[PDB]
Design a protein around this nucleic acid. Structure first.
Ligand code: CA
Ligand code: CA
Ligand code: CA
Length: 255
DNA sequence: GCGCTGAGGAGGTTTCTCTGTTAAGCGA
DNA sequence: CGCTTAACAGAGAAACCTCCTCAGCGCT
């Protein structure tokens, strides 16, 4: 407790799906920390807000798409509750700069739009693969980050067959270091693919990798919370039907 | 009354996620 | 051969990040 390990889960989850933003408001400035998910996670925004004790929740539907936000902008609530979290549990991607800049500005009582210095994320990495795996909270943080950015899919090759394939995938923009640390923490061997938009994309599909993914969510000191838990659990079940997996990996159903 | 504020509402954009397809590993 | 994985990657929804107007509130 204090900032009990579930607080790491959070910074992970925000790092992937959230954002620390200071925005114009005429003469004035707003400081948002917001997360904005698909409507599918209504249940979890309220979880996060329950955990945190702050922020306003809103719903939004643009064209066919229903979305939900938790948004924290009260600057007294940022100072007292949010900053000791990300100070306690700092982020691990290069978003850290977003936070640092933001904290700094907030703490200097910058209220006027024209006072605000021009900012732009350092492209330089702020961190080393090594410092990452060695990061005591990291265990916890990785559940959070997987809530946001991980993807447990199973799918069938070939279109015209019974043969399934059971996968885990995660990705970052300008996240070669971060992706590499995860990839190394879980003892993968596959290529981290690097795409046209500098997206660094991890994907594994073997039995031994998967045996490991499963291993990790199972041993990790915090559970998934949102739609992801659901996603995980169905995939588990799924894995019990494909033979290569079912025969090497302890496959519980009490997650 | 004045200056500042968070909530509310919205636009602009792109980073993912999720599900493959093709070809090559490999146990045998 | 035949079960298994590795590399590549489209596409478009689920994120990411912004700016504005408004009432209310606590100052002097
Ligand atoms: Ca994300
Ligand atoms: Ca992200
Ligand atoms: Ca997500």
């Amino acid at each position: 407790s204090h900032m009990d390990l579930t607080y790491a889960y959070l910074v992970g989850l925000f790092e992937g799906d959230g954002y620390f933003s200071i925005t114009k408001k005429g003469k004035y400035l707003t400081y948002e920390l917001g997360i904005e998910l698909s409507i599918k996670d209504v249940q979890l925004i309220y979880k996060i807000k329950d955990i945190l004790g702050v922020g306003k929740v809103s719903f939004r539907k643009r064209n066919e798409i229903e979305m939900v936000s938790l948004r924290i902008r009260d600057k007294n609530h940022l100072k007292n509750f949010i900053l000791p979290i990300f100070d306690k549990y700092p982020m691990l991607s290069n978003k850290q700069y977003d936070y640092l800049r933001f904290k700094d500005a907030l703490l200097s009582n910058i209220i006027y739009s024209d006072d605000l210095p021009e900012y732009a994320r350092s492209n330089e990495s702020i961190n080393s693969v090594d410092s990452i795996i060695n990061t005591s909270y990291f265990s916890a943080w990785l559940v959070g980050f997987i809530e946001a950015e991980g993807c447990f899919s199973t799918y069938k090759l070939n279109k015209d067959d019974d043969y399934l394939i059971a996968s885990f995938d995660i990705a970052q923009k300008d996240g070669d270091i971060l992706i590499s640390a995860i990839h190394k923490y879980l003892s993968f061997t596959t290529k981290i693919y690097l795409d046209k938009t500098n997206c660094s994309r991890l994907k594994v599909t073997g039995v031994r990798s998967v045996k490991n993914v499963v291993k990790f969510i199972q041993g990790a000191p915090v559970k998934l919370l949102g739609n992801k838990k659901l996603q995980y659990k169905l995939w588990i079940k799924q894995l019990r039907k494909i033979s290569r997996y079912s025969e090497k990996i302890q496959l519980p159903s009490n997650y």
